[PDB]
Symmetry: D2
Subunit: 498 residues, 4 copies
């Protein structure tokens, strides 16, 4: 029996804060140095472990191919290191929305946008023929279209330039995570719910496989199956803001239940898995032998989860239906590269969602985290929308330790880390910043911060294993681990006794 | 993330087997040495960790006060030690039923039965005036009636004679547990459901506080409360085989809900707690500084648990009702002496009980184990009735690890050990003995036996703390820890995934 | 291979400081509270782990038998606990010199001195017939002469009164060591070099076995050997300030080499061992089951060590000669009670001693510590004379870790602790107190203090085993472990590389 | 204090046996499969941990550049894996003597010998102009002379072909060490004592830097120092079998003490260090992220060690003189690649060497192992000549743990492993094989074999750091750690007590 009052370190969970969006201007400039280093000081005073910042592709390689400028980000990291915080870098091969709302506009290298200018098919395309310019379609990962280099080669060269230019921070251990962007918002998914094309929650979304490079692939595949006459979904699949039932593809016993539907969804989902597999290999080769975690982000698509079609998840590329786990195979893939899974949604509660949405964020989180730990990989996460209430802090606290704390040692289930939405004035406001420091404490299980990177203490990155299209075994349905009902360590409460 | 296939030792749970009832004759004789040492060899071949044997008081101190004969038990232990098994000794200050059914008859020292012969009040008495001769009423713990010695002093002298005569086995570490008998069948309870007086499941039972020594105590207490005119229950409490509702004491809003009823139940239950407290102190003083666990046994009284009166538990001395945990204070008491709680019922399932019984064995087990771990003590257990089916083996397996195994280290919840009903021919039968060896393996979490006493590896016994009638704080209701639905490691099944 | 800059905790060695001699007046008064709590604050500011204080027998039981007053010592400990320091209590059953030099005079309970007044034989006596009143001769351990109680019983009752009155400090873990006094200055030895009787370094000393109770014992023993006509040493043994060679008992091939000499020395040394054995048993029984170390102090008698007679050691009671280890059997005895050996001399260097003295403090320390670790017990120590130079700090540092630090884990050889001479103004003087804080740091192996009682972290006291006059096996000569030449972590130096 | 009889695992040291020289014929054939698998079975029955085998370059790439055949070695490893032994593979880029003595003849790829046929300068050359064909001179590491590939590129391609073809054995963890050959006999040294050119112990040897590629380098370097007129040693340096004093270069106050001599030796020794640095980088890049140790072998050149010139060491390339550690910088270099140092000589005793030789093998071993552990790297080793006596087994046992065993945890100093000379009939002979099994037991510190690769349990290979010609700091003289006098665990003896 444990000694009363003794809380083992294994229960500690790192907590990082995301820095303001344009902390480094679209122009490679780092302004307001003084101010920023005052917020960082407060953040550190709150017991935070570190921060997560976007290393924008459209800024570093702005001037031209292979010519990178790390000057600013260098000052930014030295500043952070000076305040005693660890660093989570996101390799952002995407655009940071430049919509009316003014929020800083950071596209991808402009010279790339000029190539797609005469070759739209480099972007993800819906069936109407709209082109999304925030990320490069996977249909061109292995295509030589960018001044000699292929999409994948551009990704490695970037991470490689980053590895060599940040070697000192990496040696010292200041950089703890390398979050590899695999699509829009840096997430391994299709751009199925583009706000720029008229999407509004809770539309089902749209399939994004109509660029020419992807189509050809679909044609070759449909022929080797003996059904050369099969086509991709059409008006039957509907549009961005449709409902599953107003559709013929997602209605109960609809087209997705068909041999042809299963063949399409299998193809579309595998295509996304393979895109992830290939990007993470380059990431593995670039960081092997270093003490740092590599992670891919998987978005949480909870709307329509309680509908037989799991429509929203399907358009995004996750083939998750009854009797078919569409997440587990991703996790086995990530397992291959000894990578961590970062799930970007876990503060939400089923009741905070309109009934009309068929949303089930909690049940989603359980399945995803369960299939991750079942394939022996570390799972990390963050919140989706900004929040400063105790309700949100408690939900996140539940998910970091589904079975509460373990007084006998490391818990049975535990997330390796959580990154908080974003640092801001509304947060640093005396009031909020108070509740916050409480949440950070509960995150550390009432322990004091430990700059020794306890737990997630970066382990040496191992060389990848070897794949096989044997992921299909991974889709076997399974019972998710049982979740506690409420948090063990609430921010404004006492020991519920479980 | 853990390494696949690596099962940490912390998940291991010791499994012992109870030896045949009269393995040592009522006459201090150890017959059939040859046969027995062949069963022990099989038992050890099954991976069992050890065995539990009754060190009968009525055999060792048979000839007369202070004159003990450990000869036979000495041969028995040397034999066991030779077969490489650990030893769980029960200090049996009780009688082993000498009913018609022939099963060996072992009373308590006959010279004691001759004293109670002219002084019946030494035995537990019901209101009709029946005397139970299997154990000495707690009303005489501190009474000088036995040739100079008091009940408690007789208990310590016994354990003390046992400590000195078994010092070598204790030094070597062969004796791992000292199970201290506190009543009938060696359990801290009142003899409320005596089969010798006509009791048949699921009778509510009867209060056992009518001996003269206890009565006086009740009179003194009722007067200092200002209600000198209060009495103990009468015909209103009913008889052994009554139902809660046919009673006026246990009916909804019955007498037990009254100020007088609460005052009686509080008194009756505290009296049992104090009897335990005093017997375990003597046990502490006798074994301090030695590497061995001391444990008290608490019986599982599941019938009528789902009735507002918790009748059966009340007559046995456990004041467990809505908004009042009658087990937690016992556990805090046991915590004081760094003692382990042995719960004698945990293979049963709610469905194996007649609906008419209002029985809830599973919900009982949860509450008892939960309140034990909440007071920071080790909880151990055993099955109540003999069983050889996979259904029973799986239930016990669930309770030893309510949240399954922990691949990251010691589980969150885990029992320190389990002792199996009893070694017998029907068990050692090729068939059964097979299922059994499977159960032992799952008990060890598919690991190989570890004679190093892993986990429960006997720690040094610490001197007791100091009580206060501050147990009353312990009766505050609480949420029990959440239990998994099915076992993690079933005997004839695969990984349910939780 | 270890990680550079990582110093494992196992290399940490606790450092305590002795408080001023009369910190509690001969009159049970604790004056200058304010001042003292200012020194304690400085001491704690120096990183010290705790302090060691004399719990004088002549103060606590001054008024009369069994009537103890812990009032003052209670204030003293609460003050110390308030400054965050651990406590090493010495059960001082001796007198604290009340010589001309004024230094506070604290005798043993005056009522005892009045008994010896008519019975001088209670004190250790030399052959001239001088009586030493600082401690009770072992010849009366088992003699009922003190108002009903025996010497040993008076010792246990004292430690028992101390255990019950200090239970809270003991529970909390503030009291870490119980140093049990076994003679003059609290050391298991004979008062062979009494400064009160004219002794001046480096006299050989005198045997102290002439009180009547001891003599009788010697007569009974000499008769069962068949030499009833043997006598104790006479003028042949010389006097306090003689040299080994001017003697006939200690000259090469002198009387100590004889069958009669060996028989006397064997008897005299065993008598001291048994006195220790019996006092430590009482100490064991009183503190079993508690988290605290019990230790006996053995004085370092280095003069005449390099002479074949080891004269000084012989008169003190240590039968240490060529081919006979007179310390190892003491250590095996101490092993029996799971006790620690505190050696009171280990800062000295062979060169700081006059050549005429035949002194070998370093070689002594090696033998004593080696035989201690060989019998599996913890060895602790302190300096003999007050010192504030780097030479002394480095010697002590060598002996705490004879083989320096271990970057792979706990060192091979390591002392469990060291108590510094005594807190004083000449030490707290800005200058000295500086060198001191350096020494404390090196003691902790350049780590920061750890109030968690790391290493010596008080383990539960185990019940004693059982002796036999089989100590004689322990006198077999043996090679001491090899010692490093210089310290690993000097106060004013760098890594000598070993 | 440790528990008696408990030997911590950290004291365990792996023991491997070298397989017979041509276990795989010069013709890629694996004959006598049956016999061999019977010896392996005995070897495993002796508790050995594994075996070390030469993966000859002249066999695998015999047919032609880039065309490797791993067929045989594949059968050999599967056989070994079947017998439950770990594998130490030597990347042998050298020749295995094909002298008169018949012992199997295995040269390097014959097509390479045909190139050097018209270009002798690819081989190491002495001043008379003799060419050694057992290894490629470092003067051609970065020269494109081998059908497009450079020496270094040929080495990586080989290790890379080995990594990919042995991936399964590597994944499983059967291959534990990758011993990278850096010269003759696979050792980082110059071929200074070639038996093929008339060398006989204890000749001083000859400098091996006269090939044209090396000379040019020496000319460029001597000019930038402003002494363009300096030359390499001549007749003044003598010949293979000369004595240090009959020379003018190695005589006291000879040419090696001169500014010109120091400049030559500095250049010659650095050249060897850099050759090692470059070969180990390729090895690092090829094995990063895998759980396997990479090691370089440094030969033990003990003759003339006790002479001021350290002649033999100087000709071999180790600039080790008074006030200059010529080994430490090698170790700091090896530290850069997280590599292990394998010292090939450590059973010898100073007394087994002719006085005329000025040999000091023991003092050599101390310095080399000490400088290795001081630069934070693991040191391993083997014996130089075959031996089956207890004298030899005890010496090796001393060096594996210079300070014996540590009952408190991992020793202060400990070798990571030892590979035994070679499996043979004279060893497997009932007699010898007996003493042997004793030695293996003492190697494991009287523990039973642990196939879990305890201790050296292959850790993940980390990416290399980055060099600088800042090795020069490493040549600062230092005190080696102190060595125990005799072994802790002798094969035919008892506890010397240190
Ligand atoms: O962006 C607003 C969108 O946020 C949430 O959905 C997130 C998802 O949980 C994870 C990933 O970061 O992207 C999705 C959207 O980009 C809300 O659930 C949703 O209602 C809201 O419209
Ligand atoms: O008391 C002065 C005495 O101290 C040292 O001898 C100590 C011994 O090392 C340990 C024990 O504390 O008692 C002995 C004396 O009581 C000096 O070595 C000695 O020279 C000095 O006279």
């Amino acid at each position: 029996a444990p000694i009363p009052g003794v809380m083992p370190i294994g229960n500690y969970v790192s907590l990082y804060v995301m820095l303001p969006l344009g902390v480094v201007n679209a122009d490679n400039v780092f302004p307001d140095k003084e101010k920023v280093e005052d917020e960082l000081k407060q953040v550190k005073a709150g017991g935070c472990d570190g921060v997560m910042v976007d290393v924008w592709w459209g800024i570093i390689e702005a001037k031209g191919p292979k010519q990178y400028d790390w000057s600013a980000y260098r000052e930014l990291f030295q500043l952070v290191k000076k305040c005693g915080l660890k660093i989570q870098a996101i390799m952002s091969f995407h655009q940071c929305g430049g919509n009316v709302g003014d929020a800083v506009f950071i596209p991808i290298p402009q010279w790339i946008l000029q190539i797609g200018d005469k070759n739209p098919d480099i972007f993800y395309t819906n069936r109407a023929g709209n082109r999304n310019q925030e990320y490069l379609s996977l249909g061109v990962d292995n295509q030589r279209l960018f001044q000699g280099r292929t999409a994948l080669e551009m990704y490695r060269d970037f991470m490689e330039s980053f590895r060599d230019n940040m070697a000192d921070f990496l040696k010292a251990g200041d950089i703890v995570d390398i979050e590899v962007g695999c699509g829009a918002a840096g997430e391994l998914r299709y751009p199925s719910y583009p706000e720029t094309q008229g999407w509004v929650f809770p539309g089902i979304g749209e399939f994004q496989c109509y660029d020419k490079y992807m189509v050809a692939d679909w044609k070759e595949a449909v022929k080797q199956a003996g059904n050369a006459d099969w086509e991709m979904p059409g008006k039957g699949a509907g549009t961005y803001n449709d409902t599953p039932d107003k559709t013929e593809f997602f209605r109960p016993n609809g087209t997705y239940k068909t041999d042809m539907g299963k063949f399409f969804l299998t193809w579309y989902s595998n295509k996304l898995i393979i895109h992830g597999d290939q990007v993470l290999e380059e990431a593995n080769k670039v960081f092997v032998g270093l003490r740092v975690n590599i992670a891919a982000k998987v978005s949480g698509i909870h709307w329509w989860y309680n509908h037989v079609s799991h429509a929203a998840e399907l358009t995004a590329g996750f083939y998750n239906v009854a009797g078919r786990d569409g997440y587990r195979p991703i996790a086995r893939m990530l397992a291959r590269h000894h990578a961590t899974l970062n799930f970007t949604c876990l503060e939400m509660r089923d009741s905070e969602q309109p009934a009309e949405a068929k949303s089930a964020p909690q049940e989603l989180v359980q399945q995803v985290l369960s299939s991750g730990w079942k394939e022996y990989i570390d799972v990390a996460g963050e919140n989706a929308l900004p929040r400063y209430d105790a309700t949100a802090y408690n939900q996140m606290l539940l998910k970091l330790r589904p079975n509460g704390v373990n007084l006998n040692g490391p818990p049975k289930l535990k997330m390796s880390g959580l990154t908080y939405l974003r640092l801001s004035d509304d947060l640093l406001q005396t009031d909020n910043f108070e509740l916050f420091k409480k949440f950070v404490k509960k995150m550390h299980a009432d322990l004091d911060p430990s700059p020794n990177a306890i737990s997630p203490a970066v382990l040496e990155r191992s060389n990848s294993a070897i794949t096989i299209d044997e992921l299909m075994e991974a889709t076997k349905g399974s019972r998710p681990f049982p979740w506690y009902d409420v948090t063990d360590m609430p921010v404004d409460g006492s020991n519920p006794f479980d």
